[PDB]
Amino acid sequence: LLKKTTGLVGLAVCDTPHERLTILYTKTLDILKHFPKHAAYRKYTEQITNEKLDMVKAEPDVKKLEALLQGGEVEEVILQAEKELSLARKMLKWKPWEPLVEEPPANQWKWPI
Amino acid sequence: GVQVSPSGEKITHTGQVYDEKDYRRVRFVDRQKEVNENFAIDLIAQQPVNEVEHRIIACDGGGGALGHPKVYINLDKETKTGTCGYCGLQFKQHH
Amino acid sequence: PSGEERCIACKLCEAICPAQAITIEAEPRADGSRRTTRYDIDMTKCIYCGFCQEACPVDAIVEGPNFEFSTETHEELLYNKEKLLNNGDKWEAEIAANIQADYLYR
Amino acid sequence: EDNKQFFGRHRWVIYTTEMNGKNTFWDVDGSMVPPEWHRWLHCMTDDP
Amino acid sequence: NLIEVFVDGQSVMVEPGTTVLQACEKVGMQIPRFCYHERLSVAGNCRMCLVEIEKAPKVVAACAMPVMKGWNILTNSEKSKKAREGVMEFLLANHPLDCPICDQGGECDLQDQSMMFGSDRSRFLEGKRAVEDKNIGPLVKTIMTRCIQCTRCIRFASEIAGVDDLGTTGRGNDMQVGTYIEKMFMSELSGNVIDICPVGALTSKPYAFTARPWETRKTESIDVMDAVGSNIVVSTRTGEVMRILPRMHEDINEEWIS
Amino acid sequence: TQLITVDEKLDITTLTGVPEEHIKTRKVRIFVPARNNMQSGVNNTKKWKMEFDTRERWENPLMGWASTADPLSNMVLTFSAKEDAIAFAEKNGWSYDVEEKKVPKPKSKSYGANFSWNKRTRVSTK
Amino acid sequence: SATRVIQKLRNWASGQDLQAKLQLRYQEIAKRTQPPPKLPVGPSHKLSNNYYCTRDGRREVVPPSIIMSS
Amino acid sequence: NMTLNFGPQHPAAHGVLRLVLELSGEMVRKCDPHIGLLHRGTEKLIEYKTYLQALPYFDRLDYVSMMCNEQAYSIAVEKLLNIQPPPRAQWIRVLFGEITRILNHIMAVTTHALDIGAMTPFFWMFEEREKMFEFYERVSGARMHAAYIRPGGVHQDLPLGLLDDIYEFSKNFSLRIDEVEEMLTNNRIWRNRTVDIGVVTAEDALNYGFSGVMLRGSGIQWDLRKTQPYDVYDQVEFDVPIGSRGDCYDRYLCRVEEMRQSLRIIEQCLNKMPPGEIKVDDAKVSPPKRAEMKTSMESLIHHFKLYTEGYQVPPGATYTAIEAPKGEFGVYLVSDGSSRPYRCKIKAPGFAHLAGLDKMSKGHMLADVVAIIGTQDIVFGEIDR
Amino acid sequence: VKPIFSRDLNEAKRRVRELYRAWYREVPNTVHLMQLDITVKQGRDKVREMFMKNAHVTDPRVVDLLVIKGKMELQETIKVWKQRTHVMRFFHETETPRPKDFLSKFYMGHD
Amino acid sequence: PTVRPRSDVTHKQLSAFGEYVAEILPKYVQQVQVSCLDELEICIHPDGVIPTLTFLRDHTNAQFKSLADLTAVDVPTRQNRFEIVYNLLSLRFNSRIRVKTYADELTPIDSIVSVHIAANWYEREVWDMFGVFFFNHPDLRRILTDYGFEGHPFRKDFPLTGYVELRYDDEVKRVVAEPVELAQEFRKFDLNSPWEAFPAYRQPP
């Protein structure tokens, strides 16, 4: 049975955690297809979402999904993965994979000074 | 034994006396000037010299850790008594 | 215990005082000894923190167990040297038994 | 001083009618405690 | 005429006839000292400066070693730190504990090297020596109990002041420094003997006990009243002049004062 | 975003909020400090310090404490470069006065020089 | 120091043993005139192997390592 | 809308706070708090002094939880200096820091009850607080501001026969905690007062910088004692309290469960006390004893330099967030290599809480907002600095 | 150097004119509502002389930071977070001005 | 027993995480320092501070949701004197991170309100105490200073004792302001010992 109390407050429980997690993991995989291959956020984000989605299609139990996601609870990793989806769209807007925009002065990061 | 000023007030052991043409005695009218009667200059010649049978001695001020740290003072000078630099009590060589 | 004001003018108890309350400008006593001519704590500054009673190498300043010294004007909480000396002369029988029962801890 | 009350109650003091030229029959303040008894009255020690 | 000198892996090219003190001063690491003033003669008399010279089994005195060829001076090594903490324990064995009586609270050059380069808890439990006080003059107060016999005052008085009066009498811990006959050591350049002395054994009688150097504010000026025009550190405490000290200047001053 | 191309000397008087007399009637000293002459250590003198001109410090008429007219007299400041210190003094707008860094010179000091045959460097004591 | 009727009245009001565990300290205070306690020394009050360069906690730190960039 | 100033002088603002409220009706629309009425410049004033002179600020910043903040500051200074405390002193740290936890939670439950209007545990808990301040005065000699935790372990030892009096306090404290839990949790007035009022989501409780008892009222498990092991808190075994409905009532019962759990850890602190020393055996971060000082020499040298200059502290930055019972307390010390700190930010727990009070006080009224400042437990010295 | 709002001086001068317009609009409400012991004319002259106090700066980022500091003073003046004590310490009703000639500065102190 | 014991497994795994973030953000990250105290000091560029903190909050492998601390440390040697820190703290990974950027007092930093509403008050406190513009803040209203306090006080060029000092008068019956002259001067102590303290932290000439 699904949990009545979610273990939190405000973060409401959902009825289809496998469906929302597979659907939003395929959405955050589809967002990184417009990322460049030169960007290594694409490779490491595709690695962590591919390994976690492989755990999702490996296990059908909700508490085993919590134990192999290792993110506390399933609604917490749904919330944090939708923040990761918004981060991937925002970093598509920002493009951080290019090199450093300005070198600092050489006395800026020296301690003690 | 508190000495008095020419104005009429008391003089501390630091030698401080307010002069006659100073306004700073105007907090001294109808309120008493606090002066300790036991001068530390006068209360050091009352106790006699302590006899030392060695060439050096080490005082503590009485009480061990209550008093002062244990300074070894030299007693080779016989014409002047070797004063402890922490207290001020005087030591005299016995021979 | 035989006369002789214990304050040996080290100028270290205002380097520990976080109020910056203590001005202890000294001179020699014209005796060969070493005492103070100017002591000032400030009771209005004076955080009552116990640092100067633990800094003091001869335990000259102490913090005697009083609280009945609430005054009406600001001038009477500006303890210079003679008020401090007859304060310790007033409470010397009260302080020294507490120091004798307390000096194993410090 | 007695024993069967709580702490702070069990050691106490009735003050003088006057001392040092001030009549303390009605105006009674806690600064007239002698210093040899100020250690005893605040229970810093057990012996009188 | 340059020598490749390693100071913990540095590559300092230095001229021959130098000290390991100067070879470390060109790096920035400062070897701890009591006998060696910079502008006095070399005489190893305190043995604080011990550093090892890359794997030779005796640690060497860094005052009087000319660096020869490729010697790696290990300043922060195990045997050098053991030698520094040991010699500070040797200095603080027979020192008397007059540090609140002393004029040099923060101007003590031995409290700082004990604080950064010494041990924590002394194993001295036996009994200190004590030295008869002298009558050197109305300007140089000498409490010679706490003298470490480092001979920094006798070399200045024998070489630059030129007086030949302050020399050491005796041997062991009975060896005391000063005039043997009760002689007034009082000439020009006698107040430089006060600031040369890294211990507060001998200091001033006008500035006897009046202040303490962390409380004072040190602001600089030129001299008047003798026409050398020397550089003056005035130490001010609550708007009152407490010490006049020589600011180091290699022209005019050369660290001394009248 | 576009970079703006201006070239003026910098003033942060209105940002720092100082009164006008504390800029126009004050001068500032940028200096490596002197070595304390009873010490033989150099660690005080590696930092370029900033101090102000000392104003009037009188005695408090009740006690005799140092009463200062100026709040800026308590401040000392620490840098590590003279041109960065002069950039800070030029942006704060005070009247600078810089003393250059004075170093020890390398002197050929030897122990065997102190015991020489024909020279005058033989020390009479030991 | 209450009587039995008011003690049983507040035990009826509570259900707890307030007489056994009062909130006011009667005689559970230790005696304030005490023997002087000799405080123990620490682990490094030893005259042998008292070298500070082995126990030196304030010199064992390193300036922080820049791992990747510049 | 009236632009009402709530004012410092109204006693449910804890003496300090100017809230302004642009309120339409008594349904308050927005509440804009201008803290800064107690701004003392502690972070400016810490820099110009030594480290041991910078110690008794943290007696006074969180002034209803004192020894927790000097535990925080001295654990930051000891992590800067790489000095482990002695373990007897570490058990003294956790014992008096949990006396300080009982202190701050007594003030929290008390000022929550006074702000709602229950004036009864403003005296009933304060009698046992006077019993605890006897222990504070027994160890240090000041009732509030100890400065007893130093860097390099605590300052002095305990007076003799103290631990029997701590045990006789702790056996009697449990009935008074259960008595206040009888009087104020199962009742009808507080149940009508504290249900579905001031609910924060866990997303807002993470994104608003809420920490400690706000996070435990929101139900996430983020004590800074078992998740991050500091001092000797890893040795003791406690249950953590968590909220369920997320309201102010969940903060009230998590404070009640924190009372009982801190009393449980105080019981095992008395049971598992080790013998040992009180300061570290290093004369350059700890001042030596007077008996070895009066005879030995390097003890007086290091006494002189540690009490005038202080500790020469190696450079770098640290920030050690510990569990204050208000929440996150940690100090961001930077050191220039001298004996003065260069700067520190002192982490107030309630700074981000009273930043986020504008979210949780919407849709409520004035008695609900004085109930939520009593719930959130804002005292203002650590916040205004 | 990076800008703040203004890529030149005259646009920031227009922002200064906008802030002066809003301050001149705001100040009779904070004369009438504040129960203040002044008129509106010397208050407006105080606003004008505080604008002329920092008139010498031609730097656009410095005058943009003066624009946000004047906006915070405007935000604390439109709403009444400032009171009748805080709002008119600018007039210096109690502090005597320091004299500018040499003779009175000679007589007053070592300056 | 005197020295704190060192656990280097946290040092190498947080150094691997620091190399990870320094590789994945090469545009903004200027360096990453790892101390001996198992924490990370990622020093970045102030034009792009919001990609750095949105990456540190929203990513599943960084996951620093809770901001904790935000001030400057003002070092006047540097050309950009303010050194703005962002101390953040993961609930789930039980780890800490520090983000250090720089600031001049003329060059602004774009604010981080849109990623954390914890910094609705911290950036206002920074605008009081040091005085940097924060771009697109909801309100950057002054908080800790006085209402009308000219001068950011936590910079090194502001004094300890301030410039104004309040005083009641009976001429006007207000708590008026005067330029401060002290009853007692704060005695500046020379607490820097003149001998060399740490040989590892030695400045090259």
Ligand code: SF4
């Ligand atoms: S009170 Fe103590 S520490 Fe202070 S000067 Fe006097 S003897 Fe020295």
Ligand code: SF4
């Ligand atoms: S008790 Fe008072 S005088 Fe003594 S150190 Fe503390 S604040 Fe200063």
Ligand code: SF4
């Ligand atoms: S010179 Fe000797 S007596 Fe004076 S402070 Fe230094 S160690 Fe102490």
Ligand code: SF4
């Ligand atoms: S008096 Fe001073 S300079 Fe001379 S030998 Fe003794 S410690 Fe050295």
Ligand code: FES
């Ligand atoms: S410093 Fe070299 S022996 Fe004295």
Ligand SMILES: [Zn+2]
């Ligand atoms: Zn003696």
